[PDB]
């Protein structure tokens, strides 16, 4: 809630989305190749694979995939890929 007007209710759902931190400054010109600055927080939408991670750079617009080794994975997303048998109790 930054501005006065607001449709969606004030809540924290992002928790679902993935979380990563740029460790190394990447560089790309092609669409698929998304650029980011170290420290920036890329919002993982649909993780492509354990190698390349898809996201977006809120504020600028850029969007695409990028090498993991470059970024830091802390909270992997969830698009209902597989169903593990009792992964964790909680």
Swiss-Prot record:
Where do the SH3 domain residues begin and end?
A: 15-76
- According to the lineage, what is the superkingdom? Eukaryota
Q: In which tissues is it expressed?
A: Both isoforms are expressed in different tissues like heart, placenta, brain, skeletal muscle and pancreas. Isoform beta is especially found in liver.
* Oligomeric and partner information: Interacts with DLG5 through its third SH3 domain. Interacts with vinculin by the first two SH3 domains and the proline rich region of vinculin. Binds to SOS (guanine nucleotide exchange factor of RAS and RAC), through its third SH3 domain. The formation of this complex is down-regulated by phosphorylation of SOS. Interacts with INPPL1/SHIP2, SAFB2, SOCS7 and SRCIN1. Interacts with FASLG. Interacts with MAPK1/ERK2.
This chain's function reads:
Vinexin alpha isoform promotes up-regulation of actin stress fiber formation. Vinexin beta isoform plays a role in cell spreading and enhances the activation of JNK/SAPK in response to EGF stimulation by using its third SH3 domain.
Return the protein name: Vinexin
Placed within the complete protein, the shown segment runs: 447 to 523 of 671
């Amino acid at each position: 809630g930054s501005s006065g007007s607001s449709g969606k209710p004030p809540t924290y759902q992002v928790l679902e989305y993935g979380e990563a931190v740029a460790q190394y400054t990447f560089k790309g010109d092609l669409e698929v190749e998304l650029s980011f600055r170290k420290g920036e927080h890329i919002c993982l939408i649909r993780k492509v694979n354990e190698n390349w991670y898809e996201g977006r750079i809120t504020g600028t617009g850029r969007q695409g995939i990028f090498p993991a080794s470059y970024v830091q994975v802390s909270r992997e997303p969830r698009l209902r890929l597989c169903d593990d048998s009792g992964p964790s109790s909680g």
